[PDB]
Amino acid sequence: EQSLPFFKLFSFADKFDYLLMFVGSLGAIVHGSSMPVFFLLFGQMVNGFGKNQMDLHQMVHEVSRYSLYFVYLGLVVCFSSYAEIACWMYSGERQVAALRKKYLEAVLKQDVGFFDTDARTGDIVFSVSTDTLLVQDAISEKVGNFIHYLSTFLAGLVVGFVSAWKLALLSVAVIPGIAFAGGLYAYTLTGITSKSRESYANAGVIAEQAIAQVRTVYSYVGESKALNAYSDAIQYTLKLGYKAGMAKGLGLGCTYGIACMSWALVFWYAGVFIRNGQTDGGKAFTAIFSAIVGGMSLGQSFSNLGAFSKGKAAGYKLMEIINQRPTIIQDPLDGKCLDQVHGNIEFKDVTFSYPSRPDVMIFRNFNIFFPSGKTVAVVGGSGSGKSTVVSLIERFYDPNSGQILLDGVEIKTLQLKFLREQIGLVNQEPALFATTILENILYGKPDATMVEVEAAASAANAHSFITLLPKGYDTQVGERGVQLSGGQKQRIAIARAMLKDPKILLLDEATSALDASSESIVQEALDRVMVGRTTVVVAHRLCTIRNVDSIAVIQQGQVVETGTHEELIAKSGAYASLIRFQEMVSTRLSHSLSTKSLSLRSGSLRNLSYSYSTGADGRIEMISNAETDRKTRAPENYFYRLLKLNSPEWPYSIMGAVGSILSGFIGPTFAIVMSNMIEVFYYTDYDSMERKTKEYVFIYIGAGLYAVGAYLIQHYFFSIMGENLTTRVRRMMLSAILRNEVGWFDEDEHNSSLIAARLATDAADVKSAIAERISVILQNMTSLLTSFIVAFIVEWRVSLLILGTFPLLVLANFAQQLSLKGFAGDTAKAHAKTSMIAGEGVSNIRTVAAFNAQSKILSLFCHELRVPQKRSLYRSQTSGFLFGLSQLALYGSEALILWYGAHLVSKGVSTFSKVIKVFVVLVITANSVAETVSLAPEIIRGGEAVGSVFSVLDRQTRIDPDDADADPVETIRGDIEFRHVDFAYPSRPDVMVFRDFNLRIRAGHSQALVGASGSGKSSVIAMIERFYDPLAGKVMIDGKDIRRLNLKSLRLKIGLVQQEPALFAATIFDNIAYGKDGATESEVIDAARAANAHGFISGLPEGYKTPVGERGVQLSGGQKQRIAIARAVLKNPTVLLLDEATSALDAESECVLQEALERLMRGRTTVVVAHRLSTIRGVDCIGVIQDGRIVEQGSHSELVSRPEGAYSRLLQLQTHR
């Protein structure tokens, strides 16, 4: 939206950076006007090297002068490419490093309640992560290319018009006949790719509903037809991907079909102006080639504007936080400083609301008093502003109406160094900055002594635990060297509360780690520090409040009652229901940053962003997103395997590769004709310069239609091979994802949001690893070959010195194509330890506001930024000097060859138009060789990270749904008998929810599994089918082992009903027939009238046809549950399985299960679980589990005979509505 001007991005430059942009601008101009000066000397060499063919002693003079000048020109490109790289890359680094210093100063001094996670602390941390890499990439080095390739254009039209201005308009005005046809290609390329990009999203929900509902898709046998709806939704991209291979041949055929009909136009009029006597054969070499490579080089200077519009936008967000004016600031002169405080805090009608939204009201008419030297207990039951009391004494906010006084002195007339130093804060998930266990304790006071740190951790239940660590109080909590990552989080944070020695002390509900005997150890540590200090207590559970010597209770805006724990238990005033409430019983930002960073990496480069994760429990882990270089390397034999998977089309690859060698002949067909017209321009018989220039125009036309029929073959083919490979792989991947166990889908890195991308993008980059890395080899390995055969027929004494110099002429043309992207290289990885230190400074700001840590983070950030400047000083000088020397060897070795040519002509060995036919061929050849060696690591080094998708094709499953040595199933009777059987989730095996679980089910019976307050209750049905394997023992079914049978034959006769039902993106005719294939119309209609819904399904305008999955009409959960029961009643199963869990019916006036329960159990073996104790009258048995063990069994007539057992607790929960 709002954006800065491009200027004022340089507004952080000091007095030293106005000299690294004046040196660095005279460097980029003299370098820019060097290719139009190379064309001024080379058209002055040939005018002595061939007009004097009759004077062999004038040639040796005037080529020994014009080939000394290509050493003087080599020492200008030596020191003017060293001054645009080593003076811009570093001078764009002292301005961003300075930015982060002004910025971090800005964030630390802002009112502390500005950050409330409502896309706020996921926006400030992201603004220091990416926006200081978009200000850097727009002002450092791409300005040094925008100046460079501009002054080539403004000096390619001065050397052009001075020498011969009557050709400096023919050579210029033709150029829009190339770009018009060069832009028609890139126009229709989008117009067909967008037809492929849009047609895939139809298939992007079929391979999504069959993964996000993989519990249902495995439960029925519905994976064999989940490919036939993904086969018939790629075929509308294959045949649409064919004719995009046609629009690349004719887009590269109609480019050399005008290009080879454009050199004929500017070489014909050159043959006219020489005969008429206006120019000569050397000055018409300059005025053509200066205006062409000068006029074509605005396609590079207008390529930097895409990276300039990202600078003005992302720079404005950084520049508005710095000058955002806060309210609660420190006044070091307009402030007081008391002495011998008592801590008599009194709120005198203090109202307050959240400044995010003043709609709700928190402290309407709030009035409490705090004593001196006592303990109070402000306590609520829920979010009635229970943590707002500590969030107001800190001045994290201001009260919008009211006044707060300390000992008769108000705190709004005080500075924020006398107040916050005297208050200690302990709260949930306590802040441990990634340092040792000596510097975290020194945030209370930076330098007192060593022995008081030990005395602080002595009365903290820590000193025993921090001397049983094999280092001298030196243990990294951020890095996972030694982990205190047990369930008992060892509270070292209380040592900060003890060493600081505060007068006022604001504790909080610091027992929320599933408290037990382990968290009772840190409880008594808290109970011994509240001595002689004004302190409060905030509590959630009242089991730890029973020894507190004053309790004041608020309910809504105001205090209700005061006193001690003798009258609080009395009078039943909002305490007797609350103790009945006691008896009736972050890590999201790393996903939130990964969403905002997603869907924005299409325009930005991959060496620019990050990839966020939780990592350890010390910080937010920022991976530099250049992890493709050193992670997930492909299997070594992949270049043979991908050819084997793509074989049946060996006819379509031989027919293509004979259309590839013919495309490599276009190189020397240009260079051998154009090296004959620099001969013919020096004839002296002006009618012999006409009959031998009609031959040199009918070949440019004759090789201008040749390129139409030799780019059309190489690109219509090698894409039929390239689109029967991103089809056969996309159908083998889904037939290899739907064979894994279900627990692989439970992991967060394998959700149904990334695995639908690894079939979209990562399976579509095999077209560019086996079809477009052969065609850019055989095109270039037949053009290198057919030019080193023509070079050894014409003259072999010069084409041997060029072959020895050829390892240098290809390095010099290799350095001219790394400089198009800039030599900075992975600029996210060096600035990635810096941002982690700014990552702990924002998301943990509530403890930085206390302790006065606002000047210790700034000196642990300006002490670490001295590493990414002395890395950008070494790299900017070495990679600016190894570029300025690899251009000296270019111009400094084109003046050895041409000198050596003008030496042999003196001895009569070889002649003119044999030096030129060897020198001009063997420079244009080397231009194409540094396009092949540039992709040399990408072939060998694993392809790339998106071509390394073999973790789904090459991955052995655990639970195989189909075997050969497995007996099929004839008829199940139902004989579920659980033998010694324990279980845990493979995702988190730390909890061991089943402990030698045992059951027994005879055929023709039922089961009445209790909810047991959600003790893994929906997991017994998970082991009837094989969603998981038991940790030990056998699941004895039908008197047999379950893991000795063919699994696809088993699941077709055991039908279940899922916990939270959802339907597929289809009408309601598949949804009630998805559990029964082969049935057509007859018993489908009767199948609906079981959970009846029959007027609900007949009440529809479009019959039964309604989209209920997505993008149609929306139904309710009580009505969706009606549809799901119609599945199992059509399948006619043997072992029915129902489920209820955690208030998921949502059907008031419950009648959707009065019909469905008692009419369905006619001849089946059922296992029914119910979370509510209602309609729980099972008719054959019952099962009640406690912590992985059943405790009682029988009918519902011996359960009521026991006085308590375990069911008597459940009947009291009926009255807890």
Ligand SMILES: CC(C)[C@H](C)[C@@H](O)[C@H](O)[C@@H](C)[C@H]1CC[C@H]2[C@@H]3COC(=O)[C@H]4C[C@H](O)[C@H](O)C[C@]4(C)[C@H]3CC[C@]12C
């Ligand atoms: C003039 C040469 C003898 C000289 C030694 C050589 O250094 C020259 O500067 C080379 C690098 C350049 C100068 C002009 C360029 C050509 C001018 O640009 C063009 O029109 C294109 C058309 C098409 O892209 C061709 O494949 C290359 C071609 C035709 C360019 C290929 C490379 C050059 C031939």
Ligand SMILES: Nc1ncnc2c1ncn2[C@@H]1O[C@H](COP(=O)(O)OP(=O)(O)NP(=O)(O)O)[C@@H](O)[C@H]1O
């Ligand atoms: N930053 C915020 N902006 C707006 N509302 C908030 C914010 N933080 C908390 N709230 C809500 O406003 C109410 C104030 O209660 P609060 O002071 O947070 O005590 P609490 O800790 O939520 N109660 P409990 O968790 O039961 O001990 C709560 O219901 C909060 O959920």
Ligand SMILES: Nc1ncnc2c1ncn2[C@@H]1O[C@H](COP(=O)(O)OP(=O)(O)NP(=O)(O)O)[C@@H](O)[C@H]1O
């Ligand atoms: N896929 C899973 N991976 C790891 N743990 C899980 C998974 N699913 C559930 N749990 C944990 O298992 C515990 C108990 O729930 P679970 O074992 O799923 O059955 P349940 O939810 O008790 N059934 P119900 O009582 O009917 O709601 C919970 O604390 C969950 O966190």
Ligand SMILES: [Mg+2]
């Ligand atoms: Mg709280």
Ligand SMILES: [Mg+2]
């Ligand atoms: Mg459940």
